[PDB]
Structure formats: C-alpha cells, structure tokens
Design a protein around this ligand. Structure first.
Ligand code: NA
Length: 499
C-alpha cells in the first residue's frame, strides 16, 4: 500500500490482534460490583487485582492508595467498565492493564483514570465512546459545556502506552497533563487515537458561545498556561491518529522541552500546536491528510522550537470554521503573536493583556529538512488577528510576525498542482530576521520578494517505500515510517460495542 492508497483498514490491521466479543460477557450484579470495588480499596502494596471477564456498571469513585499494584483484566479486553467510574491512582507504580471503558463516562471531570502517583501506567486498554452518564449542559454563567477528560497525569514518570482511545465526542482534552515546576518525563507512546470530533450534541448551536465551546477538544494537552514557562520533558511518540478532528489543536503543547515525534496522523483535521512554552521538538512525524478538508501539520507560538524531518502530505484548507481563534492552517504555520519578541518582550502574568494564556510571537525557530508534498497551503507565514480572550471578543491592537525563523533544506513540492501555495509570505506581517539555506519551493509563493532565495527546481526524486525522497534535501526517508496497529494500540479489538 503506497502513501496515497493508505486507509484506516490498513493502518488498523494486524494478525497479532485477538477479537473480544462483548456479547459473550456477563453483566456483574450490584453485589459483585461492590465486591470488586472493596478488593480495589483493600489492596496492599505489591498485590494485584485480576478482574474476571464481565461488564461492571457504575463502579464510581475507586481510590487506589497502594503502591506497586497491578489491576488487570483476566483476559485482555474482557473487563468492560461501564456507567460512571474514576480510578483515582494515588499510590506509586500502579499499573492498569487490559481494561475497557465504554457505555459510561468519568465519575469526575479529570477522567476515567487520574494518574496522581509517580510511575503510574495505563496500558493495553480501550476507551470506546466513553461520553455518557455525566451531566452535560451549557452552564448558567456563559452557556459553556463542561470539559471531561479521559486520562489525566498529575505525577511524574507516567506511561500511557499501547491503548486505544476511540470516539471522544464531548468537550474536553482526551489526555491532560497537569504539572508543577519540575520536569515530568511522561511517555505517551504506541497508542491509537480515532474519531474524536466536536458538535455531535448541538454544542455549536449556541452561537455566542462558539469560540470557547469549539475549544478544548484536543487529543492531548501537555501542561497549561500557568505551568507553561516550566519544562515537562514529556514525549508524545509513535502514536497513530486517525480522523482526529476535535479542534484546531490536535496536540496542544503548553510547557517546555517536549518531544512530539514519529507519530502518524492520518486524515485528522487538527494540527500539532506549540501553543505555550519553549524548546519543543517536532520531528519525524508522518502527517497524511489524504486530501481531507482542514488537515494540516504544525502551528507555532513561543520560542526555541525545532521542527525537523517531518513528512506532511496532501493536506487542505487555510481557514478554520470558528473565527477569532487564530485558526490558520497549512503544513507549517508561523503564527503572529501579541508581543514584540524582537525587542525581548515576554508574556507575563502581571502585565494586563499579555498574560501567560495569550499569544507568544514565535522566535528562534529552526525549521529544517521537512518535506511538504501536495500541501494546498505549505509553509504559511501568519497574519492572524487575536482577541483579548476566548470570552472577550475585542481585537488586540499590536500584532507581531515571527522572529529569527531559520529555514534550511526544506522541500515544498507542489509539482502535481502548482496552483497550490507552497509558501505563503505576506507584506502584512514580514518575518523579522528570517534566513533561508538551500530551500526548494515548487508551486505558488505569495509575496516571494520577501524571501532571500530559494530554488524552484526539485532535486532527483526517488520513491523509497512509498515516500518521496529528494536527493540531498527534505525529510530523510530513513528516519520515517508509518505507524500501524502492528505496533500501536492494544493486543485486541472489540466487537458488539455501542457508541
Ligand atoms: Na485548544
């Protein structure tokens, strides 16, 4: 299967996968649910709970205080936890293994799994449309729907690995990292994410509330505005993402020193977003839009980031549907911001209008050896207007272009449809101190006079296992590979599920 022919059956297929039939599982009685629950809360260090095959409704608030415990399905995929539940993991070195969360929802808004301890792990588990049973209504203050997460990490050295997160379709980031002032070193790797999408419950019908109701549907948010000026040093690596269309941000990085690398992002109308925080690296990802509307690569605020060796193909669309959220899309988008970083200006919680949750003009960004192939909007130099907040629609006055953006060895290849815009420069917001080394742009370049030099001649193109390899330029195909269910997600698939 070569790039343009990839589809979800290929990505999700593997011989290694067992099939678990939900219809073969018995529904635990109220008495048995209670018995399982006491087992959880009576755990001593070093013990294990093995959950017999079955469906367990409304376990509710499950607090694990023990350390070095495993809670696992007796057969992977065959312990289905339904109705309202939250595992509150307070101990260290707690592992949840082979669980299913479906036909129900989190018992508290920070998720079915609150990883509060250190060395907590969630593995081989599946969430299937876990959007139910909790109250979900526009609030009285401002008709805002509540944000419910599925997994949150509040400790150190968490792992979320080999899980399947399918069908998140009510508001709230699917995974949230809530961190303090020191590195977290979490690993979120080898997971499958599918079919996150907004406005399935008429949320957007309240027109006045759209800018915030249409926000907070990320697949993962690492950090938050208050914690954003500290390092997380977390990794979001080797994941497979299919039809993830939650909002403009697929992955919202809001802290420093993170790695967002080697993921395959297929037909997802949502971008990797370096939203707050410094020194993040986005590398070796395969972003395959497959001509789907409003697909895109990476959008960039703040400083010192490295964007290297990504392969971004067949993406489409420039303007997101909700206005006022700077939702400008393309392969790689250098956003405008609201602070004069060329003169050393910072966001600062004390400075009114320039608080840490606002928009840090990008500076000192290295963008090197990327291949953008058949991208309708390739490298887009930002021109967004910004509003005071998600709740205040006034426009900010004073908008700045990216600074010290260093472009080297990128290939933007629109030779197939050269009317597509390979590089969108703009005299409305000229980059400051931008540099160009051995760039190759084929296709429309707007306000091209702003760019010192580039080549319009593609080097020798070979197809090396389905990818375009450009001789001596662009993404090195040796560092790239498509993630499939051969390595991503759990070791089983479920049947007879209900959305
Ligand atoms: Na967002």
């Amino acid at each position: 299967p070569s790039i343009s022919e990839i589809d979800r059956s290929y990505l999700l297929s593997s011989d290694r996968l067992t099939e678990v039939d939900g219809n073969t599982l018995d529904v635990a009685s109220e008495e048995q649910v209670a018995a399982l629950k006491a087992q959880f809360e009576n755990l001593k260090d070093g013990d294990e709970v093995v959950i017999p095959n079955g469906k367990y409704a409304n376990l509710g608030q499950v607090t694990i205080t023990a350390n070095d415990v495993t809670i696992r399905a007796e057969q992977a995929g065959a312990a289905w936890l339904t109705g309202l539940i939250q595992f509150e993991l307070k101990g260290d070195d707690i592992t949840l293994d082979g669980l299913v969360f479906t036909e129900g929802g989190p018992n508290e808004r920070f998720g079915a799994v609150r990883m509060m301890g250190n060395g907590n792990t969630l593995q081989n588990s599946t969430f299937y449309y876990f959007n139910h049973d909790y109250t979900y209504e526009p609030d009285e203050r401002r008709s805002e729907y509540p944000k419910y997460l599925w997994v949150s990490l509040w400790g150190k050295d968490g792992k979320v690995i080999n899980n399947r997160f399918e069908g998140k379709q009510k508001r709230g980031t699917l995974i949230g990292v809530q961190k303090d002032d020191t590195p977290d070193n979490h690993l979120i790797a080898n997971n499958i994410f599918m079919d996150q999408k907004p406005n399935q419950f008429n949320e957007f019908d309240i027109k006045e509330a759209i800018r915030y109701n249409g926000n907070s549907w990320e697949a993962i948010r690492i950090g938050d505005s208050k914690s954003s000026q500290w390092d997380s040093s977390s990794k979001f690596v080797n994941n497979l993402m299919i039809d993830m269309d939650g909002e403009r941000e697929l992955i919202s990085i809001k802290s420093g020193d993170n790695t967002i690398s080697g993921n395959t992002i297929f037909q997802s109308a949502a971008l990797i977003s370096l939203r707050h925080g410094k020194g993040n690296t986005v590398e070796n990802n395969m972003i395959l839009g497959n001509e789907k509307r409003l697909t895109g690569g990476i959008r960039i605020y703040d400083e010192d980031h490295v964007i290297r060796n990504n392969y971004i193909a067949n993406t489409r669309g420039r303007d997101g549907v909700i206005e006022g959220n700077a939702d400008l899309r393309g392969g790689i988008v250098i956003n405008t911001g609201i602070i004069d970083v060329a003169n050393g200006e910072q966001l600062d919680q004390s400075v009114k209008g320039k608080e840490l949750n606002k928009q840090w003009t990008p500076k000192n960004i290295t963008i090197e050896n990327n291949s953008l192939v058949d991208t309708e909007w390739g490298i887009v130099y930002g021109n967004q207007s910004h509003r005071v907040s998600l709740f205040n629609n006034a426009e900010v006055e004073g908008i700045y272009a990216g600074v010290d953006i260093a472009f080297k060895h990128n290939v933007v290849d629109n030779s197939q449809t050269p009317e597509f815009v390979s590089v969108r420069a703009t005299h409305d917001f000229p980059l400051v101190g931008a540099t160009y080394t051995d760039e190759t742009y084929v296709g429309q370049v707007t306000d091209s006079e702003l760019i010192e030099s580039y080549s319009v001649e593609l080097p020798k193109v070979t197809v090396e296992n389905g990818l375009n390899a450009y001789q001596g330029e662009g993404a090195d195909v040796s560092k790239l590979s498509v993630v499939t269910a051969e390595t991503a997600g759990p070791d089983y698939v479920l049947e007879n599920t209900t959305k």
